[PDB]
JSON list of C-alpha atoms in Angstrom, two decimals:
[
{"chain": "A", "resi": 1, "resn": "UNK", "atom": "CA", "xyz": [-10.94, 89.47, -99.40]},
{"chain": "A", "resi": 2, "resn": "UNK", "atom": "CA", "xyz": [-12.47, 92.74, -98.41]},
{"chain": "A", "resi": 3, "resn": "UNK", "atom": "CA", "xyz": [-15.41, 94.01, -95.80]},
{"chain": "A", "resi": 4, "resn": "UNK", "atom": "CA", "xyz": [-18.39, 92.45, -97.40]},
{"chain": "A", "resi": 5, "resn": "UNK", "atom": "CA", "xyz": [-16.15, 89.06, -96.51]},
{"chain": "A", "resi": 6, "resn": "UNK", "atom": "CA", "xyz": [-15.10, 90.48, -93.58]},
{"chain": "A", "resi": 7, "resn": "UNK", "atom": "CA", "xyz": [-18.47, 90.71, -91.75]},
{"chain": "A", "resi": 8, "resn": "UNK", "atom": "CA", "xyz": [-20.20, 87.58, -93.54]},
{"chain": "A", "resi": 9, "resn": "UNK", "atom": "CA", "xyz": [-17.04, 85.09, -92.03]},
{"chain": "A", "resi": 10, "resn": "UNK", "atom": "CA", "xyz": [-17.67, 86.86, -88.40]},
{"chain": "A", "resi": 11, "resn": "UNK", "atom": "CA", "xyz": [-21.89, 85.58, -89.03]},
{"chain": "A", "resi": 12, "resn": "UNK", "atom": "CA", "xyz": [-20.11, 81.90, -89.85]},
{"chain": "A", "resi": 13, "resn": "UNK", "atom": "CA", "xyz": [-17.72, 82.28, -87.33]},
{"chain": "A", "resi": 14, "resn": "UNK", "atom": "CA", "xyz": [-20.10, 82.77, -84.22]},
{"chain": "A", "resi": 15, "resn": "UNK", "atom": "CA", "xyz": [-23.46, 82.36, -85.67]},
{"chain": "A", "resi": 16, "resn": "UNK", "atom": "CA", "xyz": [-23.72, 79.30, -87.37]},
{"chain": "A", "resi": 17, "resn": "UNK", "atom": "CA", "xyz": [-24.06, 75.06, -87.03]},
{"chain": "A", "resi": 18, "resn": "UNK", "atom": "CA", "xyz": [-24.87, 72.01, -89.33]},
{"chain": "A", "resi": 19, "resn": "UNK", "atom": "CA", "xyz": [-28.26, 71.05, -89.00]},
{"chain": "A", "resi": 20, "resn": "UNK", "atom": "CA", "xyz": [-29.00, 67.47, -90.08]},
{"chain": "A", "resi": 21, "resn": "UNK", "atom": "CA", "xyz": [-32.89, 66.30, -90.71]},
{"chain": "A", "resi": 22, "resn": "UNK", "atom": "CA", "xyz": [-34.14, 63.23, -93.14]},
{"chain": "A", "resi": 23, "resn": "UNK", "atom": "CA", "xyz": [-34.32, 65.71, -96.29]},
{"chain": "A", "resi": 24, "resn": "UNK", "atom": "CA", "xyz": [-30.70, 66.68, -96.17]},
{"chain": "A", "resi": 25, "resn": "UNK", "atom": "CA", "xyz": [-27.61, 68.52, -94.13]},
{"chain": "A", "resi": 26, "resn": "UNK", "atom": "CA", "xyz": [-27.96, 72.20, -94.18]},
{"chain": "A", "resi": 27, "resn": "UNK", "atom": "CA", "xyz": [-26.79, 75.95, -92.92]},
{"chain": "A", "resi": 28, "resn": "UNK", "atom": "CA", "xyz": [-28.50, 76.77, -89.97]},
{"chain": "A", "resi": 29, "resn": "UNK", "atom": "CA", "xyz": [-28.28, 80.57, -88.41]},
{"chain": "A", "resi": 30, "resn": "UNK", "atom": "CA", "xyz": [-28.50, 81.04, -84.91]},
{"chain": "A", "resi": 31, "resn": "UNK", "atom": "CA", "xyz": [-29.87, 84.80, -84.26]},
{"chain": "A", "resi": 32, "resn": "UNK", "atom": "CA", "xyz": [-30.14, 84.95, -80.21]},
{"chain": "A", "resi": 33, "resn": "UNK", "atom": "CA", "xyz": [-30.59, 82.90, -77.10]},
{"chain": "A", "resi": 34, "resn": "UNK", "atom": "CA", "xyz": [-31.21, 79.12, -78.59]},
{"chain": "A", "resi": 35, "resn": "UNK", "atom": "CA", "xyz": [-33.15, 80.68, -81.47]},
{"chain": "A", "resi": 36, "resn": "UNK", "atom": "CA", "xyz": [-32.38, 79.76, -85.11]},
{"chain": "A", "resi": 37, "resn": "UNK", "atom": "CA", "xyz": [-33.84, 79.90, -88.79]},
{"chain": "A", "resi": 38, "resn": "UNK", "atom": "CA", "xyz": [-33.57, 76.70, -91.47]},
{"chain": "A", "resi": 39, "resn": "UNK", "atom": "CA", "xyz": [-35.77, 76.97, -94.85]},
{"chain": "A", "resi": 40, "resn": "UNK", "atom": "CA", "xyz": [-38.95, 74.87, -94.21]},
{"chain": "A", "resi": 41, "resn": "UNK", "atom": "CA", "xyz": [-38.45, 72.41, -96.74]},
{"chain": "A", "resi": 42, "resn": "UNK", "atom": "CA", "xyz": [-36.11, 70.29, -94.54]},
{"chain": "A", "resi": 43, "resn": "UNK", "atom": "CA", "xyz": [-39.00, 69.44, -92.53]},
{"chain": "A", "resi": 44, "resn": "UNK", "atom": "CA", "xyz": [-38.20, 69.58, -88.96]},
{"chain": "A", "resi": 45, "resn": "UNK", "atom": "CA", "xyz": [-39.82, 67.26, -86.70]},
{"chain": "A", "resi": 46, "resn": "UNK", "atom": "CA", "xyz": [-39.21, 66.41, -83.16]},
{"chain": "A", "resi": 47, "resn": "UNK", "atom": "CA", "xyz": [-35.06, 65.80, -83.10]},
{"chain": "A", "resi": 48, "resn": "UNK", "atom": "CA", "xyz": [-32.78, 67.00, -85.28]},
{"chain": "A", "resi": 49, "resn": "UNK", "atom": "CA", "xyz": [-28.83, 66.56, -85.37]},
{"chain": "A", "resi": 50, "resn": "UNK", "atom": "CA", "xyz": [-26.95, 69.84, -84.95]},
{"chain": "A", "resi": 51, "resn": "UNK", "atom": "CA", "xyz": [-22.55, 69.57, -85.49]},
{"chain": "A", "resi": 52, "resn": "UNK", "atom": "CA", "xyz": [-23.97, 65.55, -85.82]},
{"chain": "A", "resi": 53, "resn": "UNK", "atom": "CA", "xyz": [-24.89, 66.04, -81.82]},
{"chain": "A", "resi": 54, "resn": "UNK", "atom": "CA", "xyz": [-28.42, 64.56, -81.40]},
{"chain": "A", "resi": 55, "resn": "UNK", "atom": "CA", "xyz": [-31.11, 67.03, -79.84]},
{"chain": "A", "resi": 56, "resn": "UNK", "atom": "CA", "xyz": [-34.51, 67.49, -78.74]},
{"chain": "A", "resi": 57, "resn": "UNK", "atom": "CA", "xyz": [-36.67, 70.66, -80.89]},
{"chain": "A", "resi": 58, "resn": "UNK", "atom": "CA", "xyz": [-38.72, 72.36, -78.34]},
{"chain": "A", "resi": 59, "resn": "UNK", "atom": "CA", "xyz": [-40.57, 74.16, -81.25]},
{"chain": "A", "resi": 60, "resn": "UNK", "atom": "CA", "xyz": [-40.95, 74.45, -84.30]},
{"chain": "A", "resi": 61, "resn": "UNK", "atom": "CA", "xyz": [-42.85, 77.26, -86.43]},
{"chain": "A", "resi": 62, "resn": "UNK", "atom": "CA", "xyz": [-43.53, 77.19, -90.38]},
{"chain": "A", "resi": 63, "resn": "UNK", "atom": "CA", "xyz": [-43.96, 81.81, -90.75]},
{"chain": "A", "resi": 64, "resn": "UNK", "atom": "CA", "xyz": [-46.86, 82.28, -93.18]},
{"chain": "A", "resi": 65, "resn": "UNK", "atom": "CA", "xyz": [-47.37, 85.78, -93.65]},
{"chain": "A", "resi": 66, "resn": "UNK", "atom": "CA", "xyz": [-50.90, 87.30, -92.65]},
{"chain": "A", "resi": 67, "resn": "UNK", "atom": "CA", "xyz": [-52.22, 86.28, -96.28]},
{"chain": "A", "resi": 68, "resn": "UNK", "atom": "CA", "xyz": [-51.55, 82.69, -95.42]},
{"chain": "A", "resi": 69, "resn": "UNK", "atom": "CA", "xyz": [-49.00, 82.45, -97.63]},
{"chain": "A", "resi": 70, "resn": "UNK", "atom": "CA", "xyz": [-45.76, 80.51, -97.17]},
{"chain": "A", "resi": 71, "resn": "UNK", "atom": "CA", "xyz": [-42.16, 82.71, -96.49]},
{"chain": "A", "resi": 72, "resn": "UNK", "atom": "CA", "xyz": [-40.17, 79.46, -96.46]},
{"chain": "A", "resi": 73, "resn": "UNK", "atom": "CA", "xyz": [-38.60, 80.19, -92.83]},
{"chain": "A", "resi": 74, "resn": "UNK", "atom": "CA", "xyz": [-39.00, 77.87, -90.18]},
{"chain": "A", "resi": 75, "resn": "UNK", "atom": "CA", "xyz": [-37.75, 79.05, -86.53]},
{"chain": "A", "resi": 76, "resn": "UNK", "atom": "CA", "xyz": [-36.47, 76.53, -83.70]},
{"chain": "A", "resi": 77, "resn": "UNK", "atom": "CA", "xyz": [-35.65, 76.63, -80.62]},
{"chain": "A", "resi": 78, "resn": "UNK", "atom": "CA", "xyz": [-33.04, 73.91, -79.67]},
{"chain": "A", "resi": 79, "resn": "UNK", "atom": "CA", "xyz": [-32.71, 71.84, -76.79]},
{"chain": "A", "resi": 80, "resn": "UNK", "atom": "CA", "xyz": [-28.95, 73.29, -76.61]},
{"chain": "A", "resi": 81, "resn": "UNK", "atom": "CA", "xyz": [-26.56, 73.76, -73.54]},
{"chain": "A", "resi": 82, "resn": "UNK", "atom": "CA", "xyz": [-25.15, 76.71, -75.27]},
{"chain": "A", "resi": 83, "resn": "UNK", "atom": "CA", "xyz": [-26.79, 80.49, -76.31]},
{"chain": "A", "resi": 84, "resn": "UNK", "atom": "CA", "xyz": [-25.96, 82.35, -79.39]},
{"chain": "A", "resi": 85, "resn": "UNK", "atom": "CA", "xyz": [-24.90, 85.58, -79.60]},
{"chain": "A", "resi": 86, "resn": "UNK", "atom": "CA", "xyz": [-27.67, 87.79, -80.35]},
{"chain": "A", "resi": 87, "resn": "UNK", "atom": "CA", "xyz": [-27.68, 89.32, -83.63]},
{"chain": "A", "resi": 88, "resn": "UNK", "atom": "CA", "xyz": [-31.00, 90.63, -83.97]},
{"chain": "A", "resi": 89, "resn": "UNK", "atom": "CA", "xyz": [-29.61, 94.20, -84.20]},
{"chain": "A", "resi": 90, "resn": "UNK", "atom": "CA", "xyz": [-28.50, 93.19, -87.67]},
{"chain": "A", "resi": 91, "resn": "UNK", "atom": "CA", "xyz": [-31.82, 92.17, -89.28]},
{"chain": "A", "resi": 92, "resn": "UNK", "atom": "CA", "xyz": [-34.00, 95.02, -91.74]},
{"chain": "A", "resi": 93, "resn": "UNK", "atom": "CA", "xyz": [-36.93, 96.28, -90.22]},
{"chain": "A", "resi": 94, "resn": "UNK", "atom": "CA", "xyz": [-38.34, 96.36, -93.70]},
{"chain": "A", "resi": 95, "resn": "UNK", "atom": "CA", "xyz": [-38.53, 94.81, -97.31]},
{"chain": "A", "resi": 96, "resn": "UNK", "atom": "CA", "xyz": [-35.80, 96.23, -99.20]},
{"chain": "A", "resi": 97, "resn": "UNK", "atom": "CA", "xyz": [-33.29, 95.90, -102.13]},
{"chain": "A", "resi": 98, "resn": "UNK", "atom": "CA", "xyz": [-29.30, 95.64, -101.55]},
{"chain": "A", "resi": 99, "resn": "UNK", "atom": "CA", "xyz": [-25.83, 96.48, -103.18]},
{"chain": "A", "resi": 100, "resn": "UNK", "atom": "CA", "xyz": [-23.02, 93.98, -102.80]},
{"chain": "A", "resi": 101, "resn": "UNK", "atom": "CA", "xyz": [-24.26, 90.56, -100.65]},
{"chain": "A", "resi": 102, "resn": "UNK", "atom": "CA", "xyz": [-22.48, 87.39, -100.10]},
{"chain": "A", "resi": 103, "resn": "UNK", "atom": "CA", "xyz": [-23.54, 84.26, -99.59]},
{"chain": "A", "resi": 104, "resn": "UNK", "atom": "CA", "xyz": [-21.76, 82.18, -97.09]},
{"chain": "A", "resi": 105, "resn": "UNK", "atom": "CA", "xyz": [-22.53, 78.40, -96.97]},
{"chain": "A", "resi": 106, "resn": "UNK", "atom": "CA", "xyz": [-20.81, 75.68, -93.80]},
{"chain": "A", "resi": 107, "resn": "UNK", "atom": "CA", "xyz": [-21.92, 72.00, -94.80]},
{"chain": "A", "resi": 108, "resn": "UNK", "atom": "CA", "xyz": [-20.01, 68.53, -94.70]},
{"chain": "A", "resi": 109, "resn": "UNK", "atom": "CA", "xyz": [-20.02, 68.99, -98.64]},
{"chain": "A", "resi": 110, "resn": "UNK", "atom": "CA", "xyz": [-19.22, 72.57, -98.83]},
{"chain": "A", "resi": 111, "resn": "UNK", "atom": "CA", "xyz": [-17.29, 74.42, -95.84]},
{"chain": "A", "resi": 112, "resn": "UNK", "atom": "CA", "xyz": [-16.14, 77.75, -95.35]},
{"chain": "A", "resi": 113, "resn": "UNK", "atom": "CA", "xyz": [-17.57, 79.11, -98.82]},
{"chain": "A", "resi": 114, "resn": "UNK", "atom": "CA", "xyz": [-18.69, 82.52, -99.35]},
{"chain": "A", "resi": 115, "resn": "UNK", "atom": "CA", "xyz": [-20.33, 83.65, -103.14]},
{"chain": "A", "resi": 116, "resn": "UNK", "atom": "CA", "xyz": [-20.20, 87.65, -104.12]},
{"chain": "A", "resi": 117, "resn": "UNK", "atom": "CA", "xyz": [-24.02, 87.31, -105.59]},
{"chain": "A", "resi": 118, "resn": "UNK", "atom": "CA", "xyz": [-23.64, 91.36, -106.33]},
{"chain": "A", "resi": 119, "resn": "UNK", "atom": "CA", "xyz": [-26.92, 93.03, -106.53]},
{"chain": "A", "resi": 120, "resn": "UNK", "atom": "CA", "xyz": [-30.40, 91.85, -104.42]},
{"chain": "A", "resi": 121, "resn": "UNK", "atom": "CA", "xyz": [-33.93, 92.46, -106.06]},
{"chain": "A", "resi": 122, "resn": "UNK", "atom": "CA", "xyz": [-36.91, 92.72, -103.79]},
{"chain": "A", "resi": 123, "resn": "UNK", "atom": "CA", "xyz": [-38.73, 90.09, -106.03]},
{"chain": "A", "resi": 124, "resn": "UNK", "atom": "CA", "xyz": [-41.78, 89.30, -104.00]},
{"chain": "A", "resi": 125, "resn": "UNK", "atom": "CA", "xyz": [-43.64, 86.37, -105.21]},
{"chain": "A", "resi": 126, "resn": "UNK", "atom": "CA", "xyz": [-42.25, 82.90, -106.20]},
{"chain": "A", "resi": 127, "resn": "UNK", "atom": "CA", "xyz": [-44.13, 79.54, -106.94]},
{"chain": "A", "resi": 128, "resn": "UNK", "atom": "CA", "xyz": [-40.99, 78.37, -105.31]},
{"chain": "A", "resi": 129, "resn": "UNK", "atom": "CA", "xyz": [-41.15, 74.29, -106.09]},
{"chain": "A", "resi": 130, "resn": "UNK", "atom": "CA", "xyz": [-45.07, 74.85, -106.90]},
{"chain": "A", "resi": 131, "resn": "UNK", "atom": "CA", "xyz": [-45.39, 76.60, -103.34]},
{"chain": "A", "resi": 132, "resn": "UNK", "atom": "CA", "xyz": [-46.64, 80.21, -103.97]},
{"chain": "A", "resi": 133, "resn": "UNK", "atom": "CA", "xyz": [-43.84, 81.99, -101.62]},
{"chain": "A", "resi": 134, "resn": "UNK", "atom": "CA", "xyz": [-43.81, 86.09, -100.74]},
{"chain": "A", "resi": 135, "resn": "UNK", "atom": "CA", "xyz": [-40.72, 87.89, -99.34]},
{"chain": "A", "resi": 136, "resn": "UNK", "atom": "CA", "xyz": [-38.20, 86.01, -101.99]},
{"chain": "A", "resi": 137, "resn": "UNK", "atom": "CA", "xyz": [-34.93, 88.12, -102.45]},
{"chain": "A", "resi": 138, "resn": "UNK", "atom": "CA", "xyz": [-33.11, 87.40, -106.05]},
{"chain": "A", "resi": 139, "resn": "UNK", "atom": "CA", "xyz": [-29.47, 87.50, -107.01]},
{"chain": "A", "resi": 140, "resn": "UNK", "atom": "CA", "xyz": [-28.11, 86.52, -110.35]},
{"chain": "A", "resi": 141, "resn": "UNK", "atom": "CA", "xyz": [-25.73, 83.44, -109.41]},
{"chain": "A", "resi": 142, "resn": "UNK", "atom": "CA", "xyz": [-25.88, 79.56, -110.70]},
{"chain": "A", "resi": 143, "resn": "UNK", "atom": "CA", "xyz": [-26.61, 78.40, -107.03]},
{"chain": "A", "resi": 144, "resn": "UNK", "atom": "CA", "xyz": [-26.41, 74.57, -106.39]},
{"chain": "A", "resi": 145, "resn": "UNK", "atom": "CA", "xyz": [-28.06, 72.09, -104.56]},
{"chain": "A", "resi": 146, "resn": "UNK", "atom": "CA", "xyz": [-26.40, 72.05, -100.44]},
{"chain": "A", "resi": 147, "resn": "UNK", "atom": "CA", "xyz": [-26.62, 75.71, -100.45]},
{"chain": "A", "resi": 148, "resn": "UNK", "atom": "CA", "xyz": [-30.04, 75.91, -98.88]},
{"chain": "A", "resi": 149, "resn": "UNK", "atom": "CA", "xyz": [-30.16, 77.39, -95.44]},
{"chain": "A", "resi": 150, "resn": "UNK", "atom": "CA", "xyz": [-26.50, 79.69, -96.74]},
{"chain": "A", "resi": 151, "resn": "UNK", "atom": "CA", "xyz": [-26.63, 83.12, -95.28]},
{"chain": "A", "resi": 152, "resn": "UNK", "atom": "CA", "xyz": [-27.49, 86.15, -97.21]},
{"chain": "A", "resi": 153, "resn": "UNK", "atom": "CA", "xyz": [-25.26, 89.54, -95.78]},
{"chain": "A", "resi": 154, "resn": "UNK", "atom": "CA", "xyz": [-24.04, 92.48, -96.49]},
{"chain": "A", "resi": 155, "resn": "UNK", "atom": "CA", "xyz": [-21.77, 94.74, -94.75]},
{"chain": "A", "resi": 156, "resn": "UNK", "atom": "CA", "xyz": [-23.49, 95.35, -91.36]},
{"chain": "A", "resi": 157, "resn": "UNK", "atom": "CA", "xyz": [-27.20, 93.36, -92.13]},
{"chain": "A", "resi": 158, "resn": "UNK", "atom": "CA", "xyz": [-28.11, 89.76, -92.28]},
{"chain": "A", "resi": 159, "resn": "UNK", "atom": "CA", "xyz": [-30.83, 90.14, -94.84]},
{"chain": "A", "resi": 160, "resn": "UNK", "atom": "CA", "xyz": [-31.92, 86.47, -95.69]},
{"chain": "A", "resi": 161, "resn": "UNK", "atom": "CA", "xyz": [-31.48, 82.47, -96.09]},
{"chain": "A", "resi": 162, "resn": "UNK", "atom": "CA", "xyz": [-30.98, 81.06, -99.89]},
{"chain": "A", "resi": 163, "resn": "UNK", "atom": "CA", "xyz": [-34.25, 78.75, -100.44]},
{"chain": "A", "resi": 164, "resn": "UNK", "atom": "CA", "xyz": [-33.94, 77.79, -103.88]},
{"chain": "A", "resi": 165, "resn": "UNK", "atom": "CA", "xyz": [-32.19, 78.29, -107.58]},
{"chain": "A", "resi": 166, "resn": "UNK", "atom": "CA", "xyz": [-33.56, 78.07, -111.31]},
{"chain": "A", "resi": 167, "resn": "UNK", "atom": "CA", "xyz": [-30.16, 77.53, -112.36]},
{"chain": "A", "resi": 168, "resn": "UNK", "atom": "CA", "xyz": [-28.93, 81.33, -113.64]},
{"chain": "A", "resi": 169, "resn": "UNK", "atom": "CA", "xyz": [-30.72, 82.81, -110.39]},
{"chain": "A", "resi": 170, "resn": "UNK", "atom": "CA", "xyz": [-31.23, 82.35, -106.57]},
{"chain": "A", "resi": 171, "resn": "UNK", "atom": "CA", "xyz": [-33.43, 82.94, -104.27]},
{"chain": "A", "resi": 172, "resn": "UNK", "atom": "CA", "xyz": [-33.48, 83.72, -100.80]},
{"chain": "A", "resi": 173, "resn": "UNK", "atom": "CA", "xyz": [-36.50, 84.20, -97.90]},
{"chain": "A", "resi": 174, "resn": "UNK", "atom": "CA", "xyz": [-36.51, 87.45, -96.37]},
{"chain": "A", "resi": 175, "resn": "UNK", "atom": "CA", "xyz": [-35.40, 87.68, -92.47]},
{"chain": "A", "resi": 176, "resn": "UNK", "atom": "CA", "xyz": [-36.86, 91.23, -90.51]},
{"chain": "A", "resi": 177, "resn": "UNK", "atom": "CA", "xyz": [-36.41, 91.62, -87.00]},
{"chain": "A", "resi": 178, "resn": "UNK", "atom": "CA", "xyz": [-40.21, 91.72, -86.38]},
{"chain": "A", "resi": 179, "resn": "UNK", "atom": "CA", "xyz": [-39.83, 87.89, -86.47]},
{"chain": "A", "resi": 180, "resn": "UNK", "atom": "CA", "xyz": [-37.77, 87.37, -83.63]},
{"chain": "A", "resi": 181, "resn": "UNK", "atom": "CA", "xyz": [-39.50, 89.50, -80.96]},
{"chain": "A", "resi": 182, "resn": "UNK", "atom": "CA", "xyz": [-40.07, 87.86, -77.90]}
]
């Protein structure tokens, strides 16, 4: 409907598959080369199913942050034919607050949806499903269950992946370009 849209439905377009593992179907973001990000709670093990297209995980790593403390991202990289286009030059360097995000969600149960969530809060810490959790971004929307793994923009950054709800909010785990150096 207007640019916040705009640039979130170009992230779908391009950036995005369905990633299938035994704890549910969810958004997964591709961010460069076979690279991508899925919230740790749908346990990836050694295959996963990605647009229902069995393939072999050639790693797998659960981010802690240097406190030992769970963010809630896991990276892959994906036994795929095919590279992503790299949009690392859209991640924060840094922790921050936002103006104006959408949420954009491509499942089976819920495609092409996007959510104006309005205003981000740095929140920090969340006993996120009795996991302590650090880096959690907040927005005040009634987010459902089949969202996890949605994207998190605004116009011109990809700021984070919704983890979790409490019903009147949601929550999302940061994404910084520090975690895709390589």
């Amino acid at each position: 409907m207007g640019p916040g849209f705009d640039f979130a439905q170009a992230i779908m377009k391009k950036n995005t598959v369905i990633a299938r593992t035994e704890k549910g179907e969810f958004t997964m973001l591709g961010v460069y080369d076979r690279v991508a990000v899925i919230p740790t709670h749908a346990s990836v093990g050694e295959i996963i199913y990605i647009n229902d297209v069995e393939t072999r995980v050639l790693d797998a790593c659960a981010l802690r942050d240097l406190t030992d403390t769970n963010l809630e991202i896991t990276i892959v990289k994906l036994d795929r034919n095919q590279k992503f286009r790299d949009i690392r030059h859209f991640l924060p360097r840094c922790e921050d607050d936002y103006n104006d995000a959408v949420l954009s969600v491509h499942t089976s149960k819920f495609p092409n949806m996007y959510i104006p969530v309005g205003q981000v809060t740095n929140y920090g810490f969340l006993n996120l499903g009795g996991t302590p959790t650090h880096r959690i971004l907040m927005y005040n929307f009634p987010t459902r269950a089949g969202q996890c793994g949605g994207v998190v923009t605004t116009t011109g950054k990809v700021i984070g992946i919704h983890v979790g709800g409490n019903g009147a909010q949601g929550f999302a785990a940061m994404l910084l370009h520090s975690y895709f150096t390589d």
